[PDB]
Amino acid sequence: SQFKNIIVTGGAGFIGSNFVHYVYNNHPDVHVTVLDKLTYAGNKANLEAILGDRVELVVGDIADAELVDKLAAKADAIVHYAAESHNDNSLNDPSPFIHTNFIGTYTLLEAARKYDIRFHHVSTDEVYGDLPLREDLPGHGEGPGEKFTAETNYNPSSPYSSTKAASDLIVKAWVRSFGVKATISNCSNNYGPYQHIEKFIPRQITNILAGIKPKLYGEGKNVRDWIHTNDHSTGVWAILTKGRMGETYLIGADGEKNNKEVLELILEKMGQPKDAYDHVTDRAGHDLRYAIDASKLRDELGWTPQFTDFSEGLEETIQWYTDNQDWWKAEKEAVEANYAKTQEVI
Amino acid sequence: QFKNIIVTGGAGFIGSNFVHYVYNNHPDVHVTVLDKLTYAGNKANLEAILGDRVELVVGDIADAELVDKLAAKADAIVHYAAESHNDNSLNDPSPFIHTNFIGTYTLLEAARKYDIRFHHVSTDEVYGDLPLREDLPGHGEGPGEKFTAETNYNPSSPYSSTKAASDLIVKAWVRSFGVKATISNCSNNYGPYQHIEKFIPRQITNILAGIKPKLYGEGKNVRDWIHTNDHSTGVWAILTKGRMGETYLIGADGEKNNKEVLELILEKMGQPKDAYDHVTDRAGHDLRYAIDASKLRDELGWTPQFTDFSEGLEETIQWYTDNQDWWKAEKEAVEANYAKTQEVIK
Numbered sequence: 076s077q078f079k080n081i082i083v084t085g086g087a088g089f090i091g092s093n094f095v096h097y098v099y100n101n102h103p104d105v106h107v108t109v110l111d112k113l114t115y116a117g118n119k120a121n122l123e124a125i126l127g128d129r130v131e132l133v134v135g136d137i138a139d140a141e142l143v144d145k146l147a148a149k150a151d152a153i154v155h156y157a158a159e160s161h162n163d164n165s166l167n168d169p170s171p172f173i174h175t176n177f178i179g180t181y182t183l184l185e186a187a188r189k190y191d192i193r194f195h196h197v198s199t200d201e202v203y204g205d206l207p208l209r210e211d212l213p214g215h216g217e218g219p220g221e222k223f224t225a226e227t228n229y230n231p232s233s234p235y236s237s238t239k240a241a242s243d244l245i246v247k248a249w250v251r252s253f254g255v256k257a258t259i260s261n262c263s264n265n266y267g268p269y270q271h272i273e274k275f276i277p278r279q280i281t282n283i284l285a286g287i288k289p290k291l292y293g294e295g296k297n298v299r300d301w302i303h304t305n306d307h308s309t310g311v312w313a314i315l316t317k318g319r320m321g322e323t324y325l326i327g328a329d330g331e332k333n334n335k336e337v338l339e340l341i342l343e344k345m346g347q348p349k350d351a352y353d354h355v356t357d358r359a360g361h362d363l364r365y366a367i368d369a370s371k372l373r374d375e376l377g378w379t380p381q382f383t384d385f386s387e388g389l390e391e392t393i394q395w396y397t398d399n400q401d402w403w404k405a406e407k408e409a410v411e412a413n414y415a416k417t418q419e420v421i
Numbered sequence: 422q423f424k425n426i427i428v429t430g431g432a433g434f435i436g437s438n439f440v441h442y443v444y445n446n447h448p449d450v451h452v453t454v455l456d457k458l459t460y461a462g463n464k465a466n467l468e469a470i471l472g473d474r475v476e477l478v479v480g481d482i483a484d485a486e487l488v489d490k491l492a493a494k495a496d497a498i499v500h501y502a503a504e505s506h507n508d509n510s511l512n513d514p515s516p517f518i519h520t521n522f523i524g525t526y527t528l529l530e531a532a533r534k535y536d537i538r539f540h541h542v543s544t545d546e547v548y549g550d551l552p553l554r555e556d557l558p559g560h561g562e563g564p565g566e567k568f569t570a571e572t573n574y575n576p577s578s579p580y581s582s583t584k585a586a587s588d589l590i591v592k593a594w595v596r597s598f599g600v601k602a603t604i605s606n607c608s609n610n611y612g613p614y615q616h617i618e619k620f621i622p623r624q625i626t627n628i629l630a631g632i633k634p635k636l637y638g639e640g641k642n643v644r645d646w647i648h649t650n651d652h653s654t655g656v657w658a659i660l661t662k663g664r665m666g667e668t669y670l671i672g673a674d675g676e677k678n679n680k681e682v683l684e685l686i687l688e689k690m691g692q693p694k695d696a697y698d699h700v701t702d703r704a705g706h707d708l709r710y711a712i713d714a715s716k717l718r719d720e721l722g723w724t725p726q727f728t729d730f731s732e733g734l735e736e737t738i739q740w741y742t743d744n745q746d747w748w749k750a751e752k753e754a755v756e757a758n759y760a761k762t763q764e765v766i767k
């Protein structure tokens with residue numbers, strides 16, 4: 076509550092809109108200006124209920140220095156969610172990832188330097204690369220280096236994750252070189268309401284609702300560490316308000332599951348047979364396992380995740396997509412068509 | 422194994438030295454230098470060797486149409502083009518973002534399109550900083566007390582951060598798209614044709630011009646000096662014999678602090694040991710760099726030839742002394758530029 080006039084970039088997207096709702100509901104002294112370009116992923120509907128005196132949407136690009144300058148002159152912090160976020164899009168056309176994830180971040184950093192304001196960079200666990208599966212690790216996942224920590228080497232695999240990693244590197248250098256008041260969070264895979272239907276969980280749920288088979292990349296052995304977006308929001312809030320300047324905090328809820336298990340759970344909850352899905356073309360350079368040790372955040376800032384029951388969180392998510400079909404139905408055909416250009420049943 | 426290579430940035434210091442190396446030692450290779458001729462690019466670095474082996478094309482690595490035209494006729498790209506100076510990056514990061522990141526991206530997309538070999542020339546600065554040997558339990562020779570291929574990226578400046586960012590996308594393009602890329606990270610180069618903004622040549626040519634040498638702070642910082650001729654053979658060995666996707670570190674076990682280097686220059690040039698100015702220290706100044714080149718040595722059999730720094734420095738001093746017309750026109754402008762942000766400490 077030290078910050079009264081914040082900019083949230085990318086706040087019309089999935090995680091960003093959840094954070095804006097978090098702020099609106101829990102920190103009534105904060106005015107939020109969302110800067111969002113409304114790409115395919117941005118959706119004014121994710122904000123509409125709360126737009127008004129407390130929350131303004133400004134449609135524009137984080138790489139538009141003149142616009143960013145105008146907004147930053149009136150702000151006391153920037154929370155940066157704006158990104159091209161999808162690995163599969165980045166493999167088809169990296170160009171917007173370069174522009175938004177790196178050039179965009181640069182532009183916002185230079186504004187933060189100019190006005191000497193607080194900057195929180197929202198990043199991802201994918202910057203660290205991949206890990207082996209637990210069955211293949213001498214400590215079964217519990218040993219040193221078998222999860223990501225704030226000391227783990229960057230080793231990104233894709234155009235998406237390398238542009239994210241690159242953005243993280245310039246944030247840190249802007250701290251050291253210019254004294255920018257920045258922190259960074261690297262979070263594991265989010266799920267919950269308002270996630271774009273291109274992403275794994277909502278794609279399967281909405282495919283089922285639309286009468287299309289879910290799609291599993293390869294055999295589905297890949298492992299993601301799932302956190303509910305609501306816990307991501309409180310994590311970012313903790314770091315924004317209490318984080319040590321220049322530090323990286325990892326956010327995760329100890330929720331590792333393989334894709335096959337998540338899909339099978341979705342099928343069971345939606346009353347579908349356990350074989351009612353297609354294996355499809357695997358992703359180029361697909362990252363195997365991601366896993367976060369969130370000890371630093373928990374121990375230093377007192378944060379704890381509330382949604383640690385994945386089965387319950389997934390039920391609520393399923394219900395959300397089922398109750399909000401008008402939010403996604405018009406995008407379904409185009410998203411499945413785009414996937415068909417590069418994915419076949421195997 | 423390559424007959425038609427593009428050397429980006431080959432009108433600059435290290436790049437031109439490489440071009441000379443290829444001209445001399447591999448006269449069957451055709452080199453096309455692609456260089457924008459920034460303040461740091463100098464036709465005089467190549468003029469005497471232009472002909473059937475070496476051609477200069479003036480242009481920007483971020484000019485995709487030009488890059489396309491050249492890459493269509495090439496079998497390898499060796500990528501030196503960069504904004505190279507930490508001090509410049511602190512005053513204006515903008516060209517670093519453009520050249521170092523967007524330029525590397527543009528070249529990687531051309532390498533990917535034409536399926537040609539790509540060697541990315543990078544720097545030890547991507548790893549950040551190390552303590553001085555006196556503050557280390559192994560006095561520089563223990564685990565983690567020098568950089569290795571396993572060291573975390575942690576760059577300090579807009580320069581080193583954009584170089585690190587470029588290394589990350591190279592590696593992701595290998596994993597995601599199968600680009601035939603290698604990376605090298607080299608310690609500080611010295612030798613003929615280095616621009617007089619850089620440490621060693623600045624001091625030598627100040628003394629020649631009757632201007633005091635300039636030492637940042639008290640000169641505690643440590644750089645690991647390698648003659649550019651050894652960098653050239655390192656790059657050649659990686660280009661022709663390296664394993665796709667690998668990173669190799671290049672260094673010659675040449676750590677010295679800046680005060681010692683300056684004192685050696687003063688002594689060799691017949692100046693008093695105290696005939697210099699302490700000047701404003703660099704923001705975020707990296708303390709010590711140090712490279713463990715064991716991988717390159719072990720795997721590719723590379724050995725540096727110029728390991729007597731005293732002799733290499735003497736020859737470098739003599740080169741600047743014998744080629745005053747090569748630098749004299751830049752002296753006043755470079756010193757005036759420094760005067761904008763640097764003053765004598767008193």
Ligand SMILES: NC(=O)c1ccc[n+]([C@@H]2O[C@H](COP(=O)([O-])OP(=O)(O)OC[C@H]3O[C@@H](n4cnc5c(N)ncnc54)[C@H](O)[C@@H]3O)[C@@H](O)[C@H]2O)c1
Pocket residue numbers: 084085086087088089090091110111112113114115116117118135136137138155156157158159160161174175179197198199200239261262263264265266270271
């Ligand atoms: N989804 C996850 O699991 C996850 C894991 C942790 C963090 N990440 C990071 O969280 C952030 C948000 O991810 P998400 O899942 O909400 O993404 P999303 O794809 O749902 O939203 C991206 C948002 O950014 C906006 N945007 C894109 N380019 C822009 C530009 N140039 N200028 C202004 N706005 C632009 C889009 O319009 C959209 O509203 C990203 O930085 C992502 O890298 C995501």
Ligand SMILES: NC(=O)c1ccc[n+]([C@@H]2O[C@H](COP(=O)([O-])OP(=O)(O)OC[C@H]3O[C@@H](n4cnc5c(N)ncnc54)[C@H](O)[C@@H]3O)[C@@H](O)[C@H]2O)c1
Pocket residue numbers: 429430431432433434435436455456457458459460461462463480481482483500501502503504505506519520524542543544545584606607608609610611616
């Ligand atoms: N100098 C060193 O100690 C050292 C150590 C290892 C590696 N590095 C790396 O080696 C490379 C060359 O360094 P250097 O010391 O020779 O630099 P330099 O400053 O002497 O030369 C840079 C060259 O790049 C050219 N250039 C700049 N922007 C360009 C663009 N957009 N398109 C085309 N050409 C452009 C310039 O005209 C110039 O000729 C860089 O990638 C640097 O990061 C340098």
Ligand SMILES: Cc1cn([C@H]2C[C@H](O)[C@@H](COP(=O)(O)OP(=O)(O)O[C@H]3OC[C@@H](O)[C@H](O)[C@H]3O)O2)c(=O)[nH]c1=O
Pocket residue numbers: 160161162163198199200201263264265273274275276278290291292293295297298299334358
């Ligand atoms: C869309 C889709 C995905 N998958 C797999 C690929 C992954 O292993 C897993 C998750 O895929 P995505 O939803 O594409 O997420 P991921 O690549 O893990 O990245 C996500 O988490 C990290 C975030 O940084 C990123 O923005 C976000 O999209 O499911 C499938 O098996 N079937 C699918 O239809």
Ligand SMILES: Cc1cn([C@H]2C[C@H](O)[C@@H](COP(=O)(O)OP(=O)(O)O[C@H]3OC[C@@H](O)[C@H](O)[C@H]3O)O2)c(=O)[nH]c1=O
Pocket residue numbers: 505506507508544545546608609610618619620621623635636637640642643644679703
């Ligand atoms: C120009 C200058 C520098 N210094 C110090 C700062 C550094 O500790 C040291 C070397 O400075 P630079 O020549 O600026 O080199 P450095 O910053 O170490 O970076 C060089 O090596 C790594 C390369 O990546 C980079 O391109 C190249 O410029 O000398 C001085 O004390 N006096 C000076 O006048």
